Amino acid sequence: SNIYIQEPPTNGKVLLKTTAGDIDIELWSKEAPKACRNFIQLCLEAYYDNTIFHRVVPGFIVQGGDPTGTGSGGESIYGAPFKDEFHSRLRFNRRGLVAMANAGSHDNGSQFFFTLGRADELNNKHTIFGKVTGDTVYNMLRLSEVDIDDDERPHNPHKIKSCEVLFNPFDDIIPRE
Amino acid sequence: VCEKCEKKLGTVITPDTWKDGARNTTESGGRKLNENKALTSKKARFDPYGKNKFSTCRICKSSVHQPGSHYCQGCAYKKGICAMCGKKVLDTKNYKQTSV
Amino acid sequence: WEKASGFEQRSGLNQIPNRRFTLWWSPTINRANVYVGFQVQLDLTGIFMHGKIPTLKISLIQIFRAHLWQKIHESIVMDLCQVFDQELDALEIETVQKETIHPRKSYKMNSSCADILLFASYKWNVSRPSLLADSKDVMDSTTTQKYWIDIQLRWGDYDSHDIERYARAKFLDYTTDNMSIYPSPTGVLIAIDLAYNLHSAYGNWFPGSKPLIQQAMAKIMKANPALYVLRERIRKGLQLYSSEPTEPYLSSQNYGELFSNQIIWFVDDTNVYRVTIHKTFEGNLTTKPINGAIFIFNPRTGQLFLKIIHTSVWAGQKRLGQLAKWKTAEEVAALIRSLPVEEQPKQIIVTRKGMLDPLEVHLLDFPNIVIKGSELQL
Amino acid sequence: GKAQSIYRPSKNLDKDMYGDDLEARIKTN
Amino acid sequence: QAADLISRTAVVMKTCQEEKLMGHLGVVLYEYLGEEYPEVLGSILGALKAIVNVIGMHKMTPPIKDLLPRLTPILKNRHEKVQENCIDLVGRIADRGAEYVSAREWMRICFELLELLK
Amino acid sequence: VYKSTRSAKPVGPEDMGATAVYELDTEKERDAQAIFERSQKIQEELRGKEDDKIYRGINNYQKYMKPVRKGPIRAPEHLRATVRWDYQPDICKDYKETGFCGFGDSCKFLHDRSDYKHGWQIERELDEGRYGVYEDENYEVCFICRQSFQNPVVTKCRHYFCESCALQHFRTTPRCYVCDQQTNGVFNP
Amino acid sequence: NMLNLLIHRKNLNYLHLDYNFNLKPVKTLTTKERKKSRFGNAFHLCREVLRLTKLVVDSHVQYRLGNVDAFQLADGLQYIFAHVGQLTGMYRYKYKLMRQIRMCKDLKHLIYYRFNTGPVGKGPGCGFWAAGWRVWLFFMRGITPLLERWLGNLLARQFEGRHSKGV
Amino acid sequence: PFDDEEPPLDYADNILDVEPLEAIQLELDPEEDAPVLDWFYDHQPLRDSRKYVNGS
RNA sequence: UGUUGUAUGAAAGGAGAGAAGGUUAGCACUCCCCUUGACAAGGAUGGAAGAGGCCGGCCU
Ligand SMILES: O=P(O)(O)O[C@H]1[C@H](OP(=O)(O)O)[C@@H](OP(=O)(O)O)[C@H](OP(=O)(O)O)[C@@H](OP(=O)(O)O)[C@H]1OP(=O)(O)O
Ligand SMILES: [K+]
Ligand SMILES: [K+]
Ligand SMILES: [Mg+2]
Ligand SMILES: [Mg+2]
Ligand SMILES: [Zn+2]
Ligand SMILES: [Zn+2]
Ligand SMILES: [Zn+2]
């Protein structure tokens, strides 16, 4: 069979309910444990709720996860930006990958993005920590069907209605208050 | 040339042997009776004072050989265009034109 | 193969006869399963060569010259688009768009795009994936608005030319692939075998789309221009000429289809309930029943299965004209169970319209046999 | 060599073989 | 005889506005060029001559780019029917369609024409 | 909207495709080899018995004789063949360029004159972005006083001039300004 | 990395070596490029030996990642050693190799008919890989001197330059 | 087992610190196979033990 | 606080592949290389020169 899975297996799964619809994200918890732990803990405490997908570059990315909506504000669970972590089997070559956004090296916040196609130049610059699977990837694509105004802003941005941890790979996440 | 430019072509003095679609036979009307050669001389021939003066290719600047042509044979073959007007007569995306 | 007209430079060997020989026996010279380690694909085609036979390569490149493989692909995509455009109201298609096909698509055998998109007016109940030749499809499975169609071409050979099975395999590989770009979860893949002139499809069907594709593919394989140029180039490569002055009088499409890969059985049961009238002393005419028969005929092998119905079955019953029809369906189911699996039919053609209903009821173990009624009953 | 030719309905040969329509010939006989 | 019948009924398909079918025929007759019997090849060429006249050079399928370099080795054929029908086809392309070939091609095809004078 | 099934398991095969078979050929049970195996078994069964004349299949009937091969070969399921592109076109270069070959019928390359692009050339043009980019560009082939159009008024021959300026221009010269055409006094709104 | 560096020193940028050690051109070649990019039996012999080694190591990789069972590893290894002719293509360079290949096939019959006895039916599950593995090891005992000599000549001709007087 | 275009795996990312699966081992009887039970499936099972093998 | 320390292949533009009529087959002598694991074989027969005397020139 000439079809090969190039990627290591996932472990752990997070549901996003959005105004585009539902999104299943399953996580690479061995390969990128910091960002996965971050993302699960922010989901368990409703950090992402009512955050918009503020930056959209069609055929490239859909950015999100800023509670201000500005494009400049994120708080990790570690009180500080955390490190990048790369894997040789995790490469930006397809749509439906979930990665952490940053401004520069070792600067990770709560912002993330979905990819919408091949992005070769994002390699070794952004931590890939999850992928979108099932039919819900088609819902993800509909996040990029927006009327995009200047500076890559939607007219009426889609937003996150809730989150849900379907399966938690870690055992010791204590959500903050 | 393209199809609208073929009225600008010159004709051979002798009539064509394949009569259909010819421009120089009596029946076509392009070979007319009682022609005065001095009156029809400057038609579709070079005239440096007249309207068809010695032209050069707009691309390569070498001299064309047909009156009223703006593109020399090689440049027109390679770009796929009519030698007189420059409208394209051929889609050359899949043709590696070889000048050899 | 002889000299094609009526009676009355450099030395070396000429490769015209050897290349003719190598084209003609090429499904067997180009066996794909003899040794299955390495393969070479030719440049603009989807022909695989197993082993380096260099007269065969010249034979094949002479056929697919001047980008014929792409040309065939685009001609079939154009023809299917013109089929669906005639049918926007009946299937409730809002629009039919042809995808801007990445130019190298039709001979790239690892991955595929979509070729046609259908956008719905409202929504289409979508069933689970099945073949083009299956029958009983339940439209409950999913619901959608987009629906893609993907055209595949292949060149088979002697060891491998099952086209239904190819269509299934390519569908399940491409739609479950991680690197796939399909616009929706639902669609169909259509596979055409140019070496053998076979075709099939596999995928999701929305209501009314399977019969449409069946007719469309039959018509397209019969009458495409680019396929005519392909078959014409093969015959010139082989220098094959026809002895016969015209096409056979019974050249109808239905007649031609009877001799495809699929098994087709004619069932004739008008003679099942058969009687004789004779004169009585009472003055009223009487009918005595006599033995009947069901005819099942396989045209390709010329096999007649004759089921002799003895009148003992009719003894104690009241309305006989239906019992015979019901019996006719049960006996046909019996014969299909009795035969080996490779003997069993794909289509059954019934001479009598009313026979069509019970038979389809009684064949439950065999849901994929279609039953229909032709125009050439005999 | 053994249709090679197009089929046309031939001229009624019952006048040749039997002298008239075969069914009529049985009727008289 | 079949190629002769195409050459007679080419005009009827123009009046019947069925250029798609005649276009298809031109594509079919292009594969019959490799004929080895000169009588058949001359009629294939005659049929082609008629289709070029009826549809025109710029809508012709196979394009004149494909048809003219196919025709230049057919020039060598010494049979008179082939030469006659090929030279007319070549000479008609030479004026109405000269941008479909390179100048080196017209030069070598020009050289070839010196054998047509015998 | 596609909704999630909400399962905890990951999607895909659990062994990550480490055992993915080749399923492009016909099924093992319906295969030519398997059919042959059934026929051999049925002939073993009928070996000692009488001819009973019942139908068992088109292939396998009573053969009175004691018990590669004819058929298609079945292919290995788990072996994935390695494919490479044959980019060598095998065209006669002389025949393609000039239409003349010194080998004739002995030439062992293709006598074909078409010059379409190769597959890798199409791919390089698609990568570089230069596939069809040239369709965009085609090769098709007052002001005396420089003031406002104070009565833009015409002559015989399209030369739209100002009114009192061109009356003074006629005072200067009796012909036009644009191409020195004979106006003959004719001067129109 | 060794074979890829050899390809890069020679300016053979139109040949690509993939990670399963197949050498393949990326475009059509001129006559000059076909003459210059032809490699000899030393290169290819070494390349096919490395291809076999990668097939063996990747099976163990698949086991250590968890994707296969230990039984599937043993069956996969014995499949590898009985089918080097289909998996590599080593025989084209040295055909004397066929002797090993034939022998491996002969061991399979010997083992298979002894393994598949009784309730055990014909099918793909036999994993007794010591015999096939043993045969190749002896092949490698003989071919190591040869390739060290041949590859020393390839490297000497690459670094010292071609030697002008000859033999 | 892996694709042509996939580069060979890194040990540190993939294989290091994952538990191996069970190997093929036939269960031994603690009564009947007492003498051979302790070291049967070790690598160089009697290597360290002085009284059975000469040494390392 | 730089520079001629060189070569291969490709593209574009040019030249054009031995045989005292034409079409060609090769194997070598010297010294200049290329592919090659070569004491093999190829690279247009791999390419390039090929009578004597005197000071590129002159004589037989
Ligand atoms: O019994 P299996 O484990 O399924 O082995 C089969 C089968 O072996 P047997 O029929 O001898 O039991 C094939 O034999 P044939 O069907 O061709 O007679 C044999 O072919 P060889 O005898 O040539 O080995 C084939 O091997 P292969 O797949 O290479 O054709 C081999 O399968 P494996 O050896 O691959 O397990
Ligand atoms: K020499
Ligand atoms: K020679
Ligand atoms: Mg030599
Ligand atoms: Mg030679
Ligand atoms: Zn020019
Ligand atoms: Zn024009
Ligand atoms: Zn040739």
Please list, residue by residue across C33-57, b when 16 or more beta carbons sit within 10 angstroms of its beta carbon and e when fewer do: beebbbebbbbbbbbbbbeeeebbb
Specify whether the CB–CB gap between F16 and H3 falls below 8 A. no
Distance G28 CA to ligand 3 centre (A): 27
Nearest CA to ligand 1 atom 19: G109
Nucleotide nearest to G157 (CA to C1'): I36
Q: In this structure, what are the phi and psi dihedrals at residue E5, rounded to the nearest 5 degrees?
A: -65, -35
- The residue in chain A having the minimum alpha-carbon distance to the alpha carbon of residue C177 is A3
The sign one gets for the Cα dihedral G120, G123, G128, G131 is positive
**CA–CA separation, G96 and G91 (whole Å):** 7
Give the 3-state secondary structure of chain C.
CCCCCCCCCCCCCCCHHHHHHHHHCHHHHCCCCCCCCEEEEECCCCCEECCCCHHHHHHHHHHCCCCHHHHHHHHHHHHHHHHHHCCHHHHCEEEEEECCCCCCHHHCCCCCCCCEEEEEEEEEEECCCEECCCCCCCCCCEEEEEEEEEEEEECCCCCCCCHHHHHHHHHHHHHHCCCCCCCCCCEEEEEEECCCCEEEEEECCCCCHHHHHHHHHHHHHHHCHHHHHHHHHHHHHHCCCCCCCCCCCCCCHHHHHCCCCCCEEEEECCCCCEEEEECCCCCCCEEEEECEEEEEEECCCCEEEEEEECHHHHCCCCCHHHHHHHHHHHHHHHHHHHCCHHHCCCEEEECCHHHHHHHHHHCCCCCCCEEECCCCCC
Question: How far away is chain G from the Cα of C38, in angstroms, using its nearest Cα?
Answer: 8
**Cβ pair E73:F98 closer than 8 A:** no
- How does strand G15-17 pair with strand A128-132? unpaired
Rounded to an integer, what distance in angstroms lies between the CA atom of residue C108 and that of residue C103? 10
G15 secondary structure, DSSP code: E
Question: Could you count the other beta carbons within 10 Å of the beta carbon of residue H27?
Answer: 6
Is E55 in contact with E67 (CB distance < 8 Å)? no
Residues E41 and E84 sit within 8 Å (Cβ to Cβ): no
Report chain I positions within 7 A of protein CB atoms.
Answer: 7-11, 13, 23-24, 31-39, 42-43
G10 lines ligand 1 (CB under 6 A): no
Burial class (CB in 10 A: 0-12, 13-18, 19+), C272: buried
For residue C90, give how far its alpha carbon lies from the nearest alpha carbon of chain A (Å). Answer: 27
Nearest CA in chain C to A5: C178
DSSP 8-state assignment for residue G87 = H
Q: C250: burial class by Cβ within 10 Å (0-12, 13-18, 19+)?
A: exposed
What is the Å distance from ligand 4's center to G167 Cα?
16
Q: Which residue has the tokens 């009598």?
A: C352
Q: CA at F121, C1' at I48: how many angstroms apart? A: 38
Task: Indicate the top mutation candidate among G107, G112, G129 to test ligand 1's pocket, ranked by most ligand atoms within 8 A of CB.
Answer: G112
Domain boundaries, chain A: 1-177
Q: What is the signed CA dihedral for H39, H40, H46, H51, rounded to 10 degrees?
A: 70
The closest of B90, E22, E73 to E90, measured between CA atoms, is E73
| C346, C263 contact by CB (below 8 A) | yes
CA C29 to mean position of chain CA atoms: 26
With CA atoms as reference, report the closest residue to C227 among C45, C71, C90: C71
Terminal-to-terminal C-alpha distance of chain H: 37
Separation of B80 CA from ligand 7 center, angstroms? 11
CB E32 to CB C236 under 8 A?
Answer: yes
Whether C31 and C56 have beta carbons less than 8 Å apart is answered as no
d(CA H43, CA H56): 12
Q: Is A166 a catalytic residue?
A: no
User: At which residue do the structure tokens 């058949």 appear?
Assistant: E40
Ligand 5 centroid to residue G92 C-alpha, Å: 28
Long-range contacts of C271-274 (CB under 8 A, 24+ apart): C271/C295, C272/C309, C272/C324, C272/C325, C272/C327, C272/C328, C273/C314, C273/C320, C273/C321, C273/C324
Q: What residues in A contact F20, CB-CB < 8 Å?
A: 1, 3
Give yes or no: A82 in active site. no
G102 C-beta closer than 6 A to ligand 1: no
Is G123 near ligand 1, meaning CB less than 6 Å away?
yes
Least distant ligand from the CA of B55 = 6
Is residue A60 among the annotated active site residues? yes
Three-class secondary structure of residue F145 per DSSP? coil
The dihedral built from the CA positions of residue C64, C66, C69 and C75, taken in this order, carries a sign that is: negative
Q: Is the dihedral of CA C294, C296, C297, C302 positive or negative?
A: negative
CA angle A107, A110, A111 (to 5 degrees): 85
Instruction: State the smallest CA–CA distance between residue F21 and chain A in angstroms.
Output: 6
Exposure letters A85-117 (e unless 16+ CB within 10 A, then b):
bebbbbbbbbbbbbbbbbeeeebbbbbbbbbbe
Q: Residue C261 carries which side chain, given as an amino acid letter?
A: N
What SS3 string covers chain D? Answer: CCCCCCCCCCCCCHHHHCCCCHHHHHHHC
Note whether F126 contacts C301, CB cutoff 8 Å: no
Contact F10 A9 (CB under 8 A): yes
Strands laid side by side in the C292-298 sheet: C303-309, C292-298, C264-268, C347-350, C370-372
Residue B88 DSSP one-character state:
B
Give the chain G residue whose CA is nearest to the CA of C40: G24
Q: Which of A55, A91, A95, A158 is catalytic?
A: A55
Chains that touch B (3 or more CB pairs under 8 A): E, F
A63 is catalytic: yes
> In this complex, is the C-beta atom of G29 within 8 Å of any C-beta atom belonging to chain F?
yes
C195, C182 Cβ separation under 8 angstroms: no
Of B86, B93, B97, the CB nearest to F139: B86
| H30/chain G closest Cα distance in angstroms | 24
A2 vs C212: CA distance, rounded Å: 32
Tell me if A10 sits within 8 A of A167, measured CB to CB: no
Written as six digits, the tokens of E3 are: 């190629």
Residue nearest to atom 18 of ligand 1 (CA): F68
User: Looking at chain F, which residue has its C-alpha nearest residue B90?
Assistant: F135
> What is the distance in angstroms measured between the alpha-carbon CA of H5 and the sugar C1' of I40?
38
Residue C239 CA: distances (Å) to CA of A101, B43, F105, H36: 65, 52, 16, 77
Distances (CA, A) of F118 to C62, C112, F143, G27: 15, 20, 56, 9
d(CA B4, ligand 7 centre) in Å = 6
Please name the residue whose Cα sits nearest to atom 12 of ligand 1.
G122
Name the β-bridge partners of G16: G24
The two tokens of residue G126 are: 């036999």
Instruction: Number of C to G CB contacts under 8 A, please give it.
Output: 7
Asked if C178 and A94 come within 8 Å (Cβ–Cβ), the reply is yes
> In angstroms, rounded to a whole number, what is the distance separating the alpha carbons of residues E102 and G92?
46
Ligand 3 center from residue E111 Cα (angstroms): 29
**Burial profile F124-137: b = 16 or more Cβ within 10 angstroms, e = fewer:** ebeeeeebeeeeee
CATH for C40-241, among 3.10.20.30, 2.60.40.10, 3.40.1000.10, 3.90.1570.40? 3.90.1570.40
Is E66 in the C-facing interface, judged by CB distances under 8 Å?
yes
Query: Which residue from G49, C179, E74, C7 is spatially nearest to A95, judged by alpha carbons?
Result: C179
Nearest CA in chain F to E63: F114
Nearest CA-CA distance, residue E35 and chain B, Å: 23
Cα separations in angstroms, C28 against A112, C25, C235, E3, F73: 56, 6, 18, 36, 11
Q: How many CB pairs lie under 8 A apart between chains C and D? A: 7
H or E element: which one contains E92? Answer: helix E80-96
Q: Return the H-helix or E-strand segment holding E64.
A: helix E64-71
Long-range pairs for G34-38: beta carbons < 8 A, 24 or more residues apart: G36/G10, G36/G12, G37/G10, G37/G12
Direct distance between the N- and C-terminal alpha carbons of chain E, in angstroms, rounded to an integer: 29
User: By the CB < 8 Å criterion, does A15 face chain F?
Assistant: yes
* Tally of CB atoms within 10 A around F33: 12
- Given a contact cutoff of 8 angstroms between Cβ atoms, the answer to whether C38 and G89 are in contact is yes
| G83 CA closest ligand 1 atom index | 29
Protein-to-nucleotide distance from the CA of B79 to the C1' of I39, whole angstroms: 58
Phi, psi angles (nearest 5°) of residue F175: -100, 180
C-alpha radius of gyration, chain F, whole number: 43
CA angle G156, G158, G160 (to 5 degrees): 55
Collapsing DSSP states into helix, strand and coil, what is residue H54? Answer: coil
Residues at the strand I interface (Cβ < 7 Å)? B 99; C 10; F 102; G 10-11, 30, 32-33, 35-36, 38-43, 149-151, 153-154, 157, 161-162, 164, 167
**Secondary structure element (H or E) that encloses residue A162, with its range:** strand A160-167
Catalytic residue among A60, A82, A92, A129: A60
Best of C36, C38, C61 to substitute, by most chain G Cβ atoms within 10 angstroms, is C38
Cα pseudo-dihedral G24, G26, G32, G34, rounded to 10: 20
Q: Ligand nearest C36 Cα, by number?
A: 1
Please report, as a single letter, which amino acid is at residue F183: T
| Element holding A128 (H helix, E strand) | strand A128-132
How far is residue E29's CA from residue E41's CA, in Å, rounded to a whole number? 10
Chains C and D touch (3+ CB pairs under 8 A): yes
Annotated resolution, angstroms: 2.9
Token couple for A166: 């379907």
